[PDB]
Symmetry: D2
């Protein structure tokens, strides 16, 4: 449909790979966080620097379900795509897919995050404009 | 009935902690992998050096589900526990819990791994002794 | 002078920073390796995938001297610049500077790497065209 | 003369090892930091949780020099040793050696750290008891 997707690419690097030149799974999760960071800065107008600084806020992960479909290797460029599954006042759920350079699905992950005060930890609502911006990404078929 | 639970501890270190003031979630996954590594070396008699070396094998992750219950902080010692959920010929599913120093649950991850040939990638059966050792960790109540 | 420099930029991310939102030093070294990887792929026509794959080669570090001049923080974009200090048949020495968005020097590192066979470790000469390409980056004032 | 050397061990893990088949060098620096962390907690009575917490302090690195002597591999246990080179009021320089299981030198790093106020960055003197504890590790022969 026309609900939004957020997309970008990531190069599989030497730092990401095991002795076989295949991606070590915790490293996918560094890739995933970088992608969420990007989405916040580019699409939601609430970059992590502002959020964790002046904002005294965070978006820690509550739940994460990841399926590793096919391996990725040193030197491949992967494409990352994000949709929003569910959006509350404080919590939000995204679905992220990583696809290889010939369009093969590499991993699919559904991730629930919660907006919190970091001084000290306690849930809080998302900023209104942020929640409004996320609403455009919502794919009602996903949940 | 009779069973076994594999358990050890890990210190939350500076390298693990982020600008929200807690453990950065990919870092939990490095701690998870370290724990699985420990299990293989210390309980299953199939250390990763041997497995990935002469063994020409690995145990890549097929599926992860992680529930983050409460945050962890610099300087805390966490307890890690492993139980086996399901055991096939090649695939195996484990449940790992991380607990805080007063036993508060921090995270629970259900993870399916698959034994593979690394030369080159293709599923293969676990060694007989290894599967037999893993069977002792089976938690029937999780089935 | 007109000897060459290799340049690119890198965003300081959440994964790079400590609890204060300042870069944790081992993370600079992940940034440094990524930059060398880039230089090999873009400038030297010998990407890490080809090098570690078909090439059965590596460029492990022999020596590294790094001065941390000023701290870097979450959300800053740093500029990375590389020059070649010294070039042998197998060994090569680079100097890398990271500068902040307002041109302040953040870190300066002189790094000696050695071309090796990875099956199994043993020095070898650089490929001729690679060594030729590095020669253009040589700043004879540096050593 | 009378002195002390701080020493402990570390296992080389899957997470540390790369596509050249050895420890990936930034990973040595995470192991270095862990070791300094250990020194502070176990020898100097100033653990990082306390230091960075109530203490509003840190010990960022100003200078690194690392000589990589021989590679390390998955499954090896390394020995880490610390000696103090130089001790000022705020700054301190340490020499750390990593050795293999048959005592072969793997790397030697000379590192200068500086005690700082984190609220906000500005050098400050080490606590008196901490400096006194560090003095016991001084290796006059390295001066
Ligand atoms: Cl590609
Ligand atoms: Cl909510
Ligand atoms: Cl939600
Ligand atoms: Cl593909
Ligand atoms: Cl029984
Ligand atoms: Cl199976
Ligand atoms: Cl299974
Ligand atoms: Cl607890
Ligand atoms: Cl067998
Ligand atoms: Cl049971
Ligand atoms: Cl900037
Ligand atoms: Cl040479
Ligand atoms: Cl050289
Ligand atoms: Cl600057
Ligand atoms: Cl004496
Ligand atoms: Cl001083
Ligand atoms: Cl000093
Ligand atoms: Cl040795
Ligand atoms: Cl004092
Ligand atoms: Cl002495």
């Amino acid at each position: 449909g026309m609900t939004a997707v957020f997309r970008n690419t990531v190069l599989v690097r030497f730092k990401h790979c095991d002795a076989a030149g295949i991606v070590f799974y915790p490293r996918y999760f560094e890739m995933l966080n970088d992608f969420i960071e990007d989405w916040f800065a580019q699409a939601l107008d609430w970059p992590f620097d502002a959020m964790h600084g002046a904002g005294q806020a965070g978006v820690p992960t509550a739940d994460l379900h990841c399926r590793f479909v096919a391996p990725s290797r040193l030197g491949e460029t992967l494409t990352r795509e994000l949709r929003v599954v569910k959006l509350g006042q404080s919590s939000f759920t995204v679905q992220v897919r990583f696809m290889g350079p010939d369009s093969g699905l590499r991993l699919e992950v559904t991730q629930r995050l919660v907006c919190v005060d970091t001084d000290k930890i306690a849930p809080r609502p998302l900023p209104d404009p942020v929640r409004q911006a996320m609403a455009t990404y919502v794919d009602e078929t996903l949940a």
